[PDB]
Design an enzyme around this catalytic site. Sequence first.
Site, short mmCIF file in Angstrom:
data_model
loop_
_atom_site.label_atom_id
_atom_site.label_comp_id
_atom_site.label_asym_id
_atom_site.label_seq_id
_atom_site.Cartn_x
_atom_site.Cartn_y
_atom_site.Cartn_z
N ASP A 181 0.82 -1.21 0.00
CA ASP A 181 0.00 0.00 0.00
C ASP A 181 0.86 1.26 0.00
OD1 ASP A 181 -2.47 -1.26 -0.15
OD2 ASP A 181 -3.32 -0.40 1.62
N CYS A 215 -1.82 0.39 -13.59
CA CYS A 215 -1.98 0.37 -12.14
C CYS A 215 -3.18 1.27 -11.83
CB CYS A 215 -0.71 0.82 -11.41
SG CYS A 215 0.34 2.01 -12.27
N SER A 216 -3.06 2.15 -10.85
CA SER A 216 -4.12 3.13 -10.62
C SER A 216 -4.14 4.16 -11.75
CB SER A 216 -4.00 3.80 -9.25
OG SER A 216 -5.25 4.35 -8.86
N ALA A 217 -3.00 4.81 -11.97
CA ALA A 217 -2.88 5.84 -13.01
C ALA A 217 -2.15 5.35 -14.27
CB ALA A 217 -2.18 7.07 -12.44
N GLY A 218 -1.51 4.18 -14.18
CA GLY A 218 -0.75 3.62 -15.28
C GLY A 218 0.55 4.36 -15.58
N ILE A 219 1.23 4.81 -14.53
CA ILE A 219 2.49 5.54 -14.69
C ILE A 219 3.56 5.13 -13.67
CG2 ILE A 219 1.52 7.56 -15.91
CD1 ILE A 219 1.64 8.98 -13.03
N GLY A 220 3.15 4.91 -12.42
CA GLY A 220 4.07 4.65 -11.33
C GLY A 220 4.67 3.26 -11.37
N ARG A 221 3.87 2.27 -10.98
CA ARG A 221 4.30 0.87 -11.01
C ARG A 221 4.37 0.37 -12.45
NH1 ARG A 221 0.50 0.64 -5.69
NH2 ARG A 221 -0.37 -1.41 -6.25
N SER A 222 3.49 0.89 -13.31
CA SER A 222 3.48 0.56 -14.73
C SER A 222 4.79 0.96 -15.41
CB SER A 222 2.29 1.23 -15.43
OG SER A 222 1.06 0.78 -14.88
N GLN A 262 7.02 7.54 -10.24
CA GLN A 262 6.37 8.64 -9.52
C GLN A 262 7.15 9.17 -8.32
OE1 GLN A 262 3.26 10.85 -9.63
NE2 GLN A 262 4.37 10.49 -11.57
C1 LIG Z 1 -10.08 16.63 -11.66
C2 LIG Z 1 -10.10 15.15 -12.04
O1 LIG Z 1 -10.87 14.77 -12.91
N1 LIG Z 1 -9.28 14.30 -11.41
C3 LIG Z 1 -9.33 14.10 -9.97
C4 LIG Z 1 -8.08 13.40 -9.47
S1 LIG Z 1 -6.65 14.33 -9.92
S2 LIG Z 1 -5.47 14.63 -8.33
C5 LIG Z 1 -4.95 13.17 -7.73
C6 LIG Z 1 -3.97 13.29 -6.57
N2 LIG Z 1 -2.62 13.12 -7.07
C7 LIG Z 1 -1.92 11.85 -6.93
O2 LIG Z 1 -1.53 11.43 -5.85
C8 LIG Z 1 -1.68 11.07 -8.22
C9 LIG Z 1 -0.22 11.21 -8.65
C10 LIG Z 1 0.10 10.39 -9.90
C11 LIG Z 1 -0.31 8.91 -9.79
N3 LIG Z 1 0.57 8.30 -8.80
C12 LIG Z 1 0.87 6.88 -8.83
O3 LIG Z 1 1.27 6.34 -9.85
C13 LIG Z 1 0.44 6.02 -7.64
N4 LIG Z 1 -0.68 6.37 -6.95
C14 LIG Z 1 -1.18 5.57 -5.99
C15 LIG Z 1 -0.53 4.37 -5.69
N5 LIG Z 1 0.58 4.02 -6.36
C16 LIG Z 1 1.08 4.82 -7.32
C17 LIG Z 1 2.32 4.40 -8.05
O4 LIG Z 1 3.38 5.02 -7.83
O5 LIG Z 1 2.19 3.63 -9.02
C18 LIG Z 1 -1.74 8.76 -9.28
C19 LIG Z 1 -2.04 9.60 -8.03
#
Ligand SMILES: CC(=O)NCCSSCCNC(=O)[C@H]1CC[C@@H](NC(=O)c2nccnc2C(=O)O)CC1
EC number: 3.1.3.48
Length: 283
Positions: A181, A215-222, A262
């Site tokens: 997590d 992954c969640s955003a497809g950038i970090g772990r991806s 990330q």
């Molecule tokens: C306004 C609108 O429509 N959008 C609403 C949401 S937009 S703001 C979201 C808050 N910002 C963040 O923390 C992002 C940063 C970029 C990305 N980070 C990761 O890759 C990550 N996140 C969670 C768990 N693990 C990871 C990982 O590193 O892979 C996803 C989470």
Amino acid sequence: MEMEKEFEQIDKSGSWAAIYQDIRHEASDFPSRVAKLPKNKNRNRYCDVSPFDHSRIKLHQEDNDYINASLIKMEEAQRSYILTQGPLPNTVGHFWEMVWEQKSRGVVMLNRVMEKGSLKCAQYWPQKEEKEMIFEDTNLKLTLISEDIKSYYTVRQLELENLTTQETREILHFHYTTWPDFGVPESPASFLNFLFKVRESGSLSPEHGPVVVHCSAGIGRSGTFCLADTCLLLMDKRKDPSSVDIKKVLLEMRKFRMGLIQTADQLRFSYLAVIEGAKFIMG
Ligand SMILES: CC(=O)NCCSSCCNC(=O)[C@H]1CC[C@@H](NC(=O)c2nccnc2C(=O)O)CC1
Ligand SMILES: [Mg+2]
């Protein structure tokens, strides 16, 4: 290896955040106009994670061709990846449409459906074989064929049917289930073994369309998955495996999708993954 000596240097000097910032500053910047379009607001998970226009995957529909997904084309390594966000309740049909149209064989999932008590991902595949999923908007049927649960990952055989044409395809779902997590894994052993398992299935091979990684955003772990795989492949290909610069490979990847890797801790993990992964092939 000279990558390990560079690794030990940054470790002893504690400059992981500074090195990561350097990459962040050097990283490519390209327009994401289609992503920011108001009609595509409900097709995006995060406001700050957009696909570049030039490398975005287009759905083969005249209505709205948008999906938050990027084609990462690694020329020298001869490898392609689609990095996408974990599908949304409204984009599950789009997701499988892309898998179908891009002729993908493998789907790589690096997150759990729930992490930190929140939903990171729609339940986009069927959990029981008797209960298929039908995606009405994209006219696709999805059936769980088999499941193999292991300690660190789960592999699923899925059948994807285009209901318009009646063609079927076997899709392999590779689900890494043990990413913590918070932070990164302590040892890259499990992650690397997971990588090798995806490799062994032919999902990353040129006779198939590009693997779909999320992954969640497809950038970090991806980003970590694709970076490690490419670096290791390059060390196998090049005269002089020591010439493989992970930072250089990452910046090349960053031309196709933003924010791959990330945190500084994710970068450190990537190094460790490549270093340990090389030691598996070079003894
Ligand atoms: C306004 C609108 O429509 N959008 C609403 C949401 S937009 S703001 C979201 C808050 N910002 C963040 O923390 C992002 C940063 C970029 C990305 N980070 C990761 O890759 C990550 N996140 C969670 C768990 N693990 C990871 C990982 O590193 O892979 C996803 C989470
Ligand atoms: Mg049963």
